[PDB]
């Protein structure tokens, strides 16, 4: 608050890094989120929804408007309760700052902040939650999942959404906003992670979505862990091929990456969704030998590991793992 005594902005402007028009216009930019305290929360939330349907890209206003939908739906308009919640505490530790802005007598979205001149919160939020299970997999996979689940939610009589929201157009708007916006992913995941009070069917949809999104983007590496873990009489050990000297570096890196994920506790299942620290170290392609061992074990039982591709350099190890497992199976079926 005051003058730029640092000299960073002046250096940036003088060297062509920030254009001159950004300050000399007719503003230049811990993330700050204004929390607009209004009297007609429900009316404002219906506007916010109408706006997202129209395709308004709120950019820096998205966080705030998404926050109001959640605050209305999950916290019943109780600003104080919301600002004290576990969700808000997590986000403050993650760099978010919440700043209340009392705003009386608002009848247009514009009064809060265009195309605005030219379906309840719960439904909007639950529709968005459908994107969680496969958001990180890709557009095609994600949208197909959404369409499939919409089939399921209807044939079960659970929840019906405007058919305008089911166009590829609209679905891509929500996909891109989910991809880009941490707050909405986090609040939906946080809600579905916990238990919720009431009889809103939307909340059951959200909880279901969050359940299906567990380990999303981590499913392949999880199945590799499964197939390199060995169930014995004396307990569970690491597959003995994974303890060979040529695999040692790989298993060291894996152990380290796996421990980083474990430090996120209850959030770990959503580490790829929320891009939590260290999660990029736990990508299956980084561990081609463990992957080969894993696929080897699977082949001996007639199974495949979708997403695992073992190159020729690792095929001998794959084949060795299959043979070790065949030998384990026959020496266990002998005692019978």
Q: Is residue 251 part of a domain?
A: yes
Which DSSP helix (H) or strand (E) runs through 237? strand 235-238
Which residue bears the tokens 């080897």?
A: 296
Residues 57 and 123 in one domain: yes
Resolution, expressed in angstroms to one decimal: 2.4
Q: Is residue 23 part of a domain?
A: no
Concatenated DSSP letters for 127-186?
HHHTTTTTTTT-HHHHHHHHHHHHHHHHHTTS----GGGGSHHHHHHHHHHHHH-HHHHH
Q: How many domains does the chain have?
A: 2
Residue ranges making up the domain that contains 35: 30-213
Please say which residue of 213, 242, 273 terminates a domain.
Answer: 213
Residues 161 and 264 in one domain: no
Which residue bears the tokens 């909007």?
A: 124
Q: Is residue 283 part of a domain?
A: yes
Please say which residue of 192, 213, 234 terminates a domain.
Answer: 213
* CA dist., res. 59 & res. 63, Å (int): 8
H helix runs in the chain, sequence order: 8-14, 41-54, 62-73, 79-84, 86-93, 121-129, 139-155, 168-180, 182-193, 201-212, 219-228, 248-262, 288-300, 315-333
Residues 84 and 178 in one domain: yes
* CA dist., res. 195 & res. 208, Å (int): 11
Experimental method: X-ray
Tell me the torsion sign for CA atoms 156, 162, 163, 166.
negative
Of 276, 122, 78, 303, residue with least CA distance to 186: 276
Tell me the torsion sign for CA atoms 248, 254, 257, 262.
negative
Which residue bears the tokens 């902005």?
A: 9
* CA dist., res. 271 & res. 311, Å (int): 28
C-alpha triplet 222, 228, 234: angle, nearest 5°: 115
Q: Which two tokens stand for residue 307?
A: 């997403």
Which residue bears the tokens 């209340």?
A: 100
Question: For 276-283, which contacts have Cβ atoms below 8 Å and span 24 or more sequence positions?
Answer: 279/218, 281/253, 281/256, 281/257, 282/218, 282/221, 282/254, 282/257, 282/258, 283/221
Of 106, 123, 103, 102, residue with least CA distance to 50: 123
Which residue bears the tokens 């265009």?
A: 114
Residues 203 and 226 in one domain: no
CATH code of the domain containing 324: 1.10.3050
């Amino acid at each position: 608050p005051g003058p730029e005594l640092s000299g960073w902005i002046s250096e940036q402007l003088m060297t062509g890094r920030i254009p001159v028009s950004d300050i000399f216009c007719d503003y230049a930019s811990q993330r700050v989120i204004p929390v607009y305290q209004v009297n007609n929360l429900e009316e404002i939330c219906q506007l916010i929804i109408q706006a997202f349907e129209a395709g308004v890209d709120f950019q820096e206003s998205a966080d705030s408007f998404l926050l109001m939908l959640c605050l209305h739906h999950a916290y019943q308009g109780d600003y104080k309760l919301f600002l004290e919640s576990g969700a808000v505490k997590y986000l403050e530790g993650h760099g978010f700052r919440f700043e209340v802005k009392k705003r009386d007598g608002v009848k247009r979205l514009e009064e809060l902040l265009r195309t605005l001149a030219a379906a309840n919160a719960g439904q909007f939020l639950s529709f968005a939650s459908l994107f969680l299970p496969k958001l990180v997999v890709g557009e095609k996979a994600c949208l197909e999942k959404v369409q499939r689940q919409i089939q399921v939610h209807a044939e079960q009589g659970l929840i019906q959404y405007p058919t305008a929201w089911q166009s590829v157009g609209h679905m891509m708007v929500i996909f891109r906003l989910m991809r880009t916006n941490f707050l909405i992913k986090f609040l939906l995941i946080h809600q579905g992670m916990h238990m919720v009070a009431g009889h809103d069917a939307n909340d059951a949809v959200i909880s279901n979505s969050v359940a299906q999104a567990r380990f999303s983007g981590l499913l392949i590496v999880k199945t590799v862990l499964d197939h390199i873990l060995q169930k014995t009489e004396r307990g569970v050990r690491l597959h003995p091929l994974a303890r060979t000297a040529k695999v040692k570096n790989e298993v060291n890196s894996f152990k380290a990456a796996l421990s980083s994920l474990a430090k996120h506790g209850e959030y770990a299942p959503f580490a790829r969704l929320l891009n939590l620290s260290g999660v990029n170290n736990l990508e299956h392609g980084l561990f081609p030998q463990l992957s080969a061992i894993a696929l080897g074990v699977a082949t001996a039982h007639g199974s495949t590991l979708a997403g695992v591709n073992v190159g020729e350099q690792y095929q001998q190890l794959r084949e060795a793992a299959t043979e070790a497992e065949k030998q384990l199976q026959q020496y266990a079926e002998s005692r019978e």
